[PDB]
Amino acid sequence: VNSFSGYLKLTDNVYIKNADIVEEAKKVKPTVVVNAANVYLKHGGGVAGALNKATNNAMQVESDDYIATNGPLKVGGSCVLSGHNLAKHCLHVVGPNVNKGEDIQLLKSAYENFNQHEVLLAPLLSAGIFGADPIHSLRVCVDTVRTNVYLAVFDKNLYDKLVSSFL
Numbered sequence: 777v778n779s780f781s782g783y784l785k786l787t788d789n790v791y792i793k794n795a796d797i798v799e800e801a802k803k804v805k806p807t808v809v810v811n812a813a814n815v816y817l818k819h820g821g822g823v824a825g826a827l828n829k830a831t832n833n834a835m836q837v838e839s840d841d842y843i844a845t846n847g848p849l850k851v852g853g854s855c856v857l858s859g860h861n862l863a864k865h866c867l868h869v870v871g872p873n874v875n876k877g878e879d880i881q882l883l884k885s886a887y888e889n890f891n892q893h894e895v896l897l898a899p900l901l902s903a904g905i906f907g908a909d910p911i912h913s914l915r916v917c918v919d920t921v922r923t924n925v926y927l928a929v930f931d932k933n934l935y936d937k938l939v940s941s942f943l
């Protein structure tokens with residue numbers, strides 16, 4: 777048993793809810809919250825800008841030190857950093873950004889990072905301002921992630937479309 781409430785069960789391991797991932801993280805304090813990161817860990821908008829704002833910019837300060845030491849992530853890659861006031865850990869995962877012309881085949885590689893963690897609170901990778909089709913992102917999630925993932929979908933309209941179109 778875990779602390780996640782109000783989710784619809786899609787599969788053995790994937791759950792979904794219409795929720796603000798920031799508000800969900802603040803309530804649950806999960807072991808792992810996933811950030812929709814870019815390779816530079818520049819958290820300006822969307823899930824990343826919202827998560828970073830909720831940490832009072834401490835996520836960005838930590839991220840800048842990580843990049844100064846290690847250089848940029850790979851598209852499809854990840855790093856584990858602090859969860860600050862939101863979670864124990866933040867898994868920063870880089871899905872391909874369609875609005876930058878990145879290979880959508882890298883979405884499966886991105887979701888494979890989730891398998892290193894038994895339970896995660898996450899957004900749909902490459903959705904929102906990353907430009908991918910969220911229906912596709914949910915299909916890749918279900919077909920790739922084997923650990924227990926609790927998906928937070930900000931848009932109520934999109935949430936309802938994801939549920940009603942799910943095979």
Ligand SMILES: Cc1ccc(C(N)=O)cn1
Pocket residue numbers: 796797798822823826899904930
């Ligand atoms: C303020 C806020 C919360 C959540 C998101 C999101 N999931 O893109 C964006 N902005």
